[model samples]
Target chain A: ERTYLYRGRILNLALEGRYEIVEHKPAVAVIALREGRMLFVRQMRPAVGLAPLEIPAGLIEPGEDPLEAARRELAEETGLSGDLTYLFSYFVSPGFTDEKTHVFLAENLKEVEAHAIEVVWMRPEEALERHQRGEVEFSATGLVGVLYYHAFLR
Target chain B: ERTYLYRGRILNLALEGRYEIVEHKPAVAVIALREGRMLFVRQMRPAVGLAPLEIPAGLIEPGEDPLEAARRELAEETGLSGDLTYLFSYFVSPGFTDEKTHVFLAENLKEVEAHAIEVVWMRPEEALERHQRGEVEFSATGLVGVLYYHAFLR
Candidate 1:
């Protein structure tokens, strides 16, 4: 008993049984570290009305591989490219939305002849400390990057 | 120019300029570690059509504090209570949704009387390994719990 309530550009709302579900496009994120700093992006999010610190991320276009999306987002947002390795994936919030995010680790960074979003390079510890001090908010991708660095990289 | 497209129980959809946004209720998650295993729950998520391992989490009710919501969710889902300490918060996916999640570290868990959701207690390494092996999927809360264990607890 599934019924569609609204279908928009980025998401669709549906009801199955008594559950309200949002079907959103899967996204890809890239985590790149260079010179003891992690790459981040800050852009005004109309949804939250704040520019949260986030890793390079964007929704996967139809028929595009997640790795390709990650590379494209990294280049488009940071004007750089690197060797990317697929990391883990997680559902952002499966309780109400089916938005899965694939993460990649980018290394051997090299600048590309480029290209809204402000590029930020900060030490992972500093980023975490800033969040702890309420100086900035992190997006899920950004937190994952920081935690992954501490858990494995450092 | 913002226009409302759909408003539902769990989320609302809006369009500002050319961007589509999902306005969702804020949520709370508890990261409780007892013994050597972290507390996790698996339940059927209609949105994803699979039961992802997630930490005890729920949306904050109207007029309810995040701490209170975290306590209630932990007790209702696991039949346990603990000393909760606020950790950090993150927007799940600010590119399209305004769903922010507040995380808490719960310690000294005490079982109370006792109450869908399968409770799984696994070591942090094991959980992370399972995700790497493609044996199980993790929700954002679950990943945060495991990562936090390695980053701080372990």
Candidate 2:
């Protein structure tokens, strides 16, 4: 038996030297397939201050489920809308933080006019090449998402 | 052929909006047991300000393999030494941080009380009771370790 409650915040750390309250954020990965290759974006990461290749993703707003957030984020960033298949989800860090992310495979693809994507769009090969050549780094979700997407296709 | 490497941190903006880094801290957990009971501990988590039921775990220092770290943690925490066996390893949460933890089980147990007994001992049933009653919290690895210990006995 579990009590399904949404308290708005899960972690609240007030102790000194570990003064950090980590709350869970629901984020999504917009995996789009073009010509049998996946699409990823390399944009500036605020935490690292370095450009990293990532599948389009962002925080799910309050009162929003991860699936809806993924669909909305997919269209908002890449201007492409596709089916968001439910995939694996895991807690980002249970030791310190309660952040959990839900990954989905966006397939049955179609292309729509992109919105605010000039800063974060690239061909799959170029993205992979830059990542391989150390031109830009890619986050694990992006890498795992791509692999998961390909495997789902097969 | 997929290769993407990126590093970044996730934050809790709704709360204090603090930050954390994505450094690697390879850890080991040991599921050592003797008779029908397993080695368990109830320790204070200063970060959470609560006593959590956990397995023997330690951070991997430099020049230490994962198994070595497991045994080392087991010895350091419980003052009980044993041979370790690798069961499996997996990423906890890839979407937020790149923290990977390795898990191992130890058998052929020996009791050498050379080191300090830093852990609060608890029987298997007592530990599970605390877990079910919500009297204690645990990371997934620790809970899984308890299950493994019991299964090994069977």
Candidate 3:
């Protein structure tokens, strides 16, 4: 006998197995940089227990290229568009989820449409400090983007 | 009515909600560096469908300190120990999983006992190149640890 469960778009199988892995749609994110500042958004994340600071990101539509997804998310969430440089991709939580996210470095940003997210800009170093102080609950993807910018892209 | 899905130790709830969240134990990870090379381990992550490269990490047992958890995981996986420096912590996937991971920089490395997992070493730049070339499937915690090392700890 096998144990299985379904929740919306997610199927939980192998319930008696070692792990409960979530097969999720791939995601795309962008670290939109202008001058010495990086773009971020503050939004409510119930799972995080707070309105955490995160980079502009969204789920990738089926068959949509990651770069295209990044561009669309940037436009829809931040009302800005930019030249996207594909950075890298990685499994978000390999031990429990197959949710991979491809992150991009966006430049030459230009405002296009009205946006809802409160777009904020701060230096990467300052952002790291806030993260260290527990003042900024940086989302996992957002933290990776910030550190990648500070480490190599900057 | 709440839809509950049980997969091993994790409890998945709220099937018809906007999100599928996994309640998981918190975890700790270490980026153990020696002679300009960071330590890693290769493991089969069923969720990712590959034996991806990962930093030493494990779940934080109830009431256990995060630092201690880091040290224990590092020792068990790599058979090496070091001075642990608390780096930062974040929810691994705040969108769906309540698995917060605390990352540390392990320095002053010393071999203590025989290890269980195969411990490997690579320069951060080389590792970054591999990840960029799509040759290395790095875990999210591993990426954060590497970028943080290159950005600040290096």
Candidate 4:
């Protein structure tokens, strides 16, 4: 069955309620905070086609809160496991896609012998400077976390 | 007319190629940086369902560069005008729908008066505090802009 939400590229939602699922990506972002310093992951995201310096994050499995997944990814990607604090969730863009994601702040952090952690630590000042200079890169949730942390969290 | 990739409910690329366009919308974000402070927009996005503490950003027309649209939106929404330094654009979630976004930094800023600039401004310190303490919210670019500012520029 062909589902339609708009006419001739114009979504007439009032005329129809039929919707189609485009992408189904369940992802998580971990904001690692330790003793006045923040831990962040800097790596390349092949999907977005850029190696943005973002917090450690990854996709979630079926039946997972992106926040809990953030905990797991934090451990796997960064070799650190801290108390996962649920901050918030959001869509990266709404114009043409549906990407719902979750954000978490990892505190009381503990690090294990981990691999694949291109992680760096920065004080709030350093983070803010980098952010304002348009230096950091991130996925949706991670980006939101970074902004929230700077504009509201720190 | 429809194809699927990834998994049943994961990073699933539902439509590999045959996607009928239903509608289009463009948006903009504003980054007003001056005197150790930047202008940000705290928008209550019903779609993502969060109060995104974002920059002055807006949408592009059907045939508009995200950059061009962003510049116009900055002025229309914030009454701030400047040239946008190109950052990057990407598919926020490529496995399913297509949401191509471009990020930028606006400098040489001049202030104008406009409606829809309802949000308030915050210093770097204040924004960070609000974000870390779970007060500020965001979309992706807003967050990444902050982090990039932290890591690279400052």
Candidate 5:
């Protein structure tokens, strides 16, 4: 059984308390890079009510290892995959969600399908700059992963 | 009226379908620098189950401006305040919480109290290193703000 705090029309919902005590599955994100470009997609976020650039990320299924989830999300969202290097993980919002996102660095990315999703490949620096300009509304996982790779991983 | 979804003990919570349209207030985080060290606080996060290090931050009270909240949270948490540099702001977790965090750069910080919180002033690079080593569990907002400052702002 689950306890819901507030529910309303279209968009309003809340869990009963703070997120740390919430029983929720973790998530995963992949910074898929090929040569000089990083793979990204723009998705409509209803919470923010805007289309924001994001990495291939999704919820981790019960019992799924974060690495496996990253691989699956990368393929599912971009129709592409590569060797995965586990980077790091963090809670998306510790105040309200137990959504720990394990970030991965994927390289040697090769197209496996007539890739769908509005995928864009840009130099990570360019993406970072766009983020700098507030032009790219960020997914928390994507923002941290990109900045981390830019600063230390690369 | 609230709906019940899942129930448990230490990590029990609820998710209403897609979280795209959830209602939430924005927040603020402060990267307060005095000399070359950045001020931080460690508090027990029952959600993450540990008092991981974090920047001074709190919710933007109803009708309260982001900058004001940043300044207030900075003082309240650390017993310190300084001139504010308005840094870039972004959503804490756009996929779920509608929590956009306005980040501020506080400089020329002066100690206003014998700060009661577990305050530690660490070199930004040291903080970054600890994060890289996974030696320090980070608040996502703090991690991104610090990395952004290191990569571009500085």
Candidate 6:
């Protein structure tokens, strides 16, 4: 048997047997590399109470495709546009949540006109070093962006 | 300013202003590489209703350190032990959930004994190829394991 406890704007809480589940909106993230640095965004996350470094990301709105969401988020968050290509997708945490994030690579960036969010452009190695030094925490999107750069780009 | 809607075994639901929040238990993942293949575990996730490939992972228990939880989860899930080293941590999805995952690298594996879960050992490149071919989906832990291999190992 399953029970739905609460449904809200961004997520729903439910239980099936002993499994606690949070049904979440699917999300998209854009990894844009320009010159020699990758684009990042930092904004206060009320949930964590810290502004962890993150790539341009947001929930995919209803009737929107992952690529479209990625482009929109990239433009809205960083005021940059680029040739976006689909990279891959992964469930954020399959053990308890149904939130999957689709990742895309955006290159050939061009700034448009563009939040509490600050745009940052840093080398992936520098970002990793800072995170290692505990100077900054990383959101999954940010870590993925850095790993992708080190694995494929750099 | 805040209201608690539901609290359960694995997570709690609340709302602050218009932001919906799911307070989830922090988790840990073990990335083990043996020879040329990486250790993976696949289990049916009730939330996603599919068994995505994941690294050995589980929620951090009360009063347990992340490294201790990683060692325990790796042993329990794969019946193996190794020299565990802390890698890094990331919040899975900070926009709506506070579920952070601490990652570790475990090498020199020795199986003790060992479920509905299936143990898999495959080259990271092969795993990435399968995921690219749409034959399998990857959890964040699995993707991180693969990316980590390509970035640092291979």
- DockQ of all models, two decimals each: 0.84, 0.08, 0.67, 0.17, 0.42, 0.87
Question: Which of the predicted structures, 1 or 5, would earn the higher lDDT when compared with the native?
Answer: 1
Q: What does candidate 3's lDDT look like per residue over B43-102, in tens digits? A: 887777786667889898877899989988888887888999898877776766678888
Error of 5 at B41 (Å): 1.4
Q: Candidate 4 residues B1-154, lDDT tens each? A: 4443323211233332434322223344545577767677765553444566667766677677777798787877677778788665433543223344567778887777645345556675577567767786555656555665664455
lDDT of 2 by residue, B1-154 (tens): 1122222222232211333333446667777666666676655553345555667876688899998898788877887788887764434443334455666878888877765224755566666566656566655455555544444444
- For residues A4-88, write the lDDT of model 5, one tens digit per residue: 5544332223344544233346778888767767787777775567876778888887778888888888888888878999866
Q: Pick the DockQ winner.
A: 6
Model 1 lDDT per residue over A1-154, tens place: 7799888888888889888888899999998999899999999998899999999999999889999999999989999999999989999999888999999999999999466889999999999999999999999999999999888887
TM-score of the candidate numbered 3? 0.92
Alpha-carbon RMSD, each predicted model:
1.1, 10.9, 2.3, 8.0, 5.0, 1.3
Error of 5 at B55 (Å): 1.0
lDDT of each: 0.92, 0.58, 0.78, 0.57, 0.69, 0.91
Sorted on lDDT, best first, the list reads: 1, 6, 3, 5, 2, 4
Candidates ranked by TM-score:
1, 6, 3, 5, 4, 2
The numbered model that scores best in lDDT is 1
Candidate 5 per-residue lDDT over residues B78-124, each given as its tens digit = 88878997766666656655667777888888778775357778877
B-chain TM-scores per prediction: 0.98, 0.75, 0.89, 0.74, 0.80, 0.97
lDDT of 6 by residue, A21-125 (tens): 888999999988887899999999999989999999999999999999998998888888889999989999888889999999998888885428899999999
Report model 3's interface C-alpha RMSD after superposition on the true interface residues.
2.2
Error of 2 at B61 (Å): 0.8
TM-scores for all candidates? 0.97, 0.50, 0.92, 0.57, 0.81, 0.97
Best-to-worst order by DockQ is: 6, 1, 3, 5, 4, 2
Cα lDDT tens digits for candidate 2, A45-154: 43444555677777788889999998887777777888778654433435555554566778776668544233354555566556556576556456544444433443
Error of 5 at A61 (Å): 1.2
DockQ of 1: 0.84
Write down the worst ten-residue block by lDDT for model 1 chain B: B113-122
DockQ preference between candidates 1 and 4, better one: 1
